[PDB]
Nucleic acid binder design. Structure first.
Lengths: 129, 150, 174, 50, 46
RNA sequence: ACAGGGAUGGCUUGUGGCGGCCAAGCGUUCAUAGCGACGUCGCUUUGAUCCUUCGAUGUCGGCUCUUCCUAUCAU
RNA sequence: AGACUAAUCGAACCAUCUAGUAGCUGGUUACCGCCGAAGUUUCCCUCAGGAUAGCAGUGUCGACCUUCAGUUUUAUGAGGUAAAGCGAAUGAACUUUAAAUAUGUAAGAAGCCCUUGUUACUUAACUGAACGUGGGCAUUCGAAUGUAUCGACACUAGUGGGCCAUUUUUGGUAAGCAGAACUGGCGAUGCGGGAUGAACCGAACGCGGGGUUAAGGUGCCGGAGUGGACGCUCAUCAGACACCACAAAAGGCGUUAGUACAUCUUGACAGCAGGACGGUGGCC
RNA sequence: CCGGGACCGAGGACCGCGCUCUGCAAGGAUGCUGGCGUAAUGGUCACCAGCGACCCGUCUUGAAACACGGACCAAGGAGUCA
């Protein structure tokens, strides 16, 4: 994998080398590539101190760097927004183009004919004997 | 007690002129009435510019007016809430109708000699109470020694 | 631990494509109200069957009332309590008129005699002793004796606390 | 009060003690209310209460 | 490795921060070798 | 000489340290490890010798006089 | 003797330069109103060190236009770590699946692609990418919640390696403890309660009236119960705001509640009446 | 639905929303009555009572404590001019 300037990457220090490494803050951090080298890459990370963000620049080896999937879902939603919008225009019905938070469950009925409930004590008697 | 992380902000614009010019006070009263009783945004802009200080009202020269009179603006009335100055590099003054706070003597003489008209802002309020067919002009604000040394 | 009621609480894991009909689990919970009953149900179910509240749902909550609240009964309670040493069994007996009243008396007794709070007590079984021979403790055996009768020596009469002064010395014989 | 519960109360418009608001139940709001549980009491109001 | 933005700005293109220590070691070795060669030449002259 | 600034504590008490062993118990029982009181064992002149005194940075006293503590020398 | 030289001597007295200089010490004069702070952020040789970020107040101006946000949700990282199963395979390092806690990135018309060519990048390569060109997408502008929260200049001021505490982490001691990161409080702050008080709990403040509470309390001091229920405990200075130490697997013929094992009408535990013998005065 | 009690009466022609519509409890108190008409109400001063309440300024650090100034009164007395 050849990373490029402007790409968004994930930093994960893999292996047993994360035993006594000095700077573990950027493990699990995501940043933008600004400098590319054969075995190193330059990553811009932002640190939040109180009410303000401060830029930091790090040099990470390639084997601890993976490309990120941050904008994958956004570009995908833009895509099927375009095709389902075109399909709705073609067929002549409205369609939902906004993702919604999860709603409470509705009312339903559960039968106990073949699913008779099992009574539980706070401890299992099989463990007692 | 109530937690107000945000803060209510007092207004950061002038509500009245600092000047003690009584005729400026009369213009301020007239344009307060116009901006309250009309729907035209021109009157509100003129009232706001009447409130302003001198460094916020740079002079507008006859050459700047002549530049802005081009491209279908020849018949419009020029409105400058500032002093209109003369430009002697402009040899031919076109016929124009300018309303301004004040004119320099050469600017007024050259406009009248070219055959145009000079108005005050109260005459402008009489003839165009809604600011119809008007070209509103400002001078170069950043053209100042302080702004250059900023 | 309050005016307790006994609730039948039935819950289950949320249905999935793999398991369309999850098993239902039923518990008898002594609780002050339904919110506490459901919270204790999810606590015990997390401790037993590894079914979390987020992935589960309450199917039913019902109140179990005593069948005969006007009949005096003997109750055996098998419980476990946690102390600084660890977990200890107890079997204790209570002469009461309902399971909930026996459980309230149990909670009061455990707090008085062993300083155990509500959280460290696990009620494992509450039973009605069907026969008089099933009574194991002498403090209930003295009460289930034949022709039981006793007086009440040294009864302090009830005097209103707003009546500060009395003109006669009270008697302790009735 | 820590900054995250402070921000959640500010977004819930609970800026003073004994302030009450109506909230529609989604996951997006339920998680916020779960975070500010050390400062609020909430429940399901009926028609009379409304 | 944290690297200051001023160092990256002054750094020439192509060079990385991972070779700076080898660079300064090579410079120190070169200086020590020049001093050793100077002493060798002077001792041979004597 | 001048201008300034200053002047560990419910501590302690009667029984050594290091190294090994034993050990009731605690743990562990898909690993049999690890802790461990009580003890114990090793190092630190036939009543002798008197020809081996091993470093003040840290300061105590005396007089008069009263009271308290008990951790008791006497009664 | 640094002694004496008009009470003046390690340099007399008098006037002047002179209102000498001090970074050090002391002091620095009416009222009301509106805002309102701060302690290694980043760089420089340090202490007898500096700037600087950040935080504030007055003015203005610009369409006070764009909206943004110490928050949740969604997707995807870190944490695969618990857990379930292994009648799935294989064997924390097993995995179909999957934790709690907070945490990084992204979530639109300012956007998404497609096409056209160039390339001085790159690629085997007109190949990707960048650069531009043109076109298509407004049928919903593409989560929730909130939004008197905009931006840019100018000028001015204090503080910019302080104290305490929760959590996380790194070290230690015989025991103490010492560094960091975030957050909260204080310095700047009144009020109710902790009898009392820098660090505790509650709660933040214009002047008044009425109602209700919080923390804490209701035997008297003292406003409010000698309130109710079930128990436990008697201390030769109990206990009532404890958790730390003394302090141990500690010592108690104190008192209750349990657990385990054991004996018991084939007579248990305690006593009383009796037996307690022979080889045998076993061997040295 | 019906009682019992406490505190409060802001505004000052009409306008509005309404209702149980000759009117109203509907965008904020009126009606009736009594005593007094003055130190009666009210105010100021002295004192007692209950409750509350460290001596100010300065310095220091993070803060207290320490330290320094203060017998009393009048007048003078310190960010000015170029």
């Amino acid at each position: 994998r050849t990373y490029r300037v402007g790409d968004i990457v994930d930093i994960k220090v893999n292996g047993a080398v994360q035993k006594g490494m000095p700077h573990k803050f950027y493990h699990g951090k995501t940043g933008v590539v600004y400098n590319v080298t054969k075995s190193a890459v330059g990553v811009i990370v932002y640190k939040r101190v109180k009410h303000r963000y401060i830029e930091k620049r790090i040099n990470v080896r390639i084997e601890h760097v993976k490309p990120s999937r941050s904008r994958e879902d956004f570009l995908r939603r833009v895509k099927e927004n375009a095709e389902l919008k075109k399909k709705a225009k073609a067929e002549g019905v409205p369609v939902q183009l906004k993702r919604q938070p999860a709603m409470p469950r509705e009312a339903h009925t559960v039968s106990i004919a073949d699913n008779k409930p099992v009574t539980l004590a706070p401890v299992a008697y099989e463990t007692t004997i | 007690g109530i937690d107000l992380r945000w803060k209510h902000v007092r207004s950061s614009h002038r509500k009245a002129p600092k000047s003690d010019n009584v005729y400026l006070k009369l213009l301020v009263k007239l344009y307060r009435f116009l901006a309250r009783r009309t729907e035209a945004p021109f009157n509100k802009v003129v009232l706001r510019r009447l409130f302003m200080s001198r460094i916020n009202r740079p002079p507008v020269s006859l050459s700047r007016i002549a530049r802005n009179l081009k491209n279908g603006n020849e018949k419009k009335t020029v409105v400058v809430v500032a002093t209109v100055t003369d430009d002697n590099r402009l040899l031919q003054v076109p016929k124009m109708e300018v309303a301004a706070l004040r004119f320099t003597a050469k600017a007024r003489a050259r406009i009248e000699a070219a055959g145009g008209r000079t108005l005050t802002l109260d005459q402008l309020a009489l003839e165009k109470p809604t600011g119809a067919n008007t070209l509103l002009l400002r001078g170069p604000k950043n053209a100042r020694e302080a702004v250059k040394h900023f | 631990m309050g005016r307790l009621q006994e609730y039948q609480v039935i819950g289950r894991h949320l249905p999935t494509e793999a398991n369309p009909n999850p098993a239902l689990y039923r518990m008898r919970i002594f609780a002050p109200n339904e919110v506490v009953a459901k919270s204790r149900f999810w606590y015990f179910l997390r401790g037993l069957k590894k079914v979390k509240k987020a992935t589960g749902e309450i199917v039913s909550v019902n109140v179990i009332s005593e069948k005969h609240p006007l009949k005096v009964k003997n109750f055996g309670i098998w419980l476990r309590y946690d102390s600084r040493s660890g977990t200890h069994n107890m079997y204790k007996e209570y002469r009461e008129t309902s399971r909930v009243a026996a459980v309230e008396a149990m909670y009061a007794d455990m707090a008085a005699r062993h300083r155990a709070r509500f959280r460290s007590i696990h009620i494992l079984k509450v039973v009605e002793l069907e026969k008089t021979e099933d009574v194991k403790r002498p403090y209930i055996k003295q009460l289930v004796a034949k022709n039981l009768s006793f007086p009440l020596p040294h009864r302090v009469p009830k005097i209103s606390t707003k009546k500060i002064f009395s003109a006669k010395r009270p008697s302790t014989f009735s | 009060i820590p900054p995250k519960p402070r921000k959640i109360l500010q977004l819930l418009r609970l800026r003073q003690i004994n302030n009450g608001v109506f909230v529609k139940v989604t996951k997006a709001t339920a998680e916020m209310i779960k975070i500010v549980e050390p400062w609020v009491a909430y429940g399901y109001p009926n028609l009379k209460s409304v | 490795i944290e690297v200051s933005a001023a160092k990256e700005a002054m750094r020439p293109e192509g060079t990385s921060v991972r070779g700076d220590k080898r660079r300064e070691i090579r410079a120190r070795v070169k200086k020590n070798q020049k001093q050793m060669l100077r002493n060798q030449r002077i001792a041979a002259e004597k």
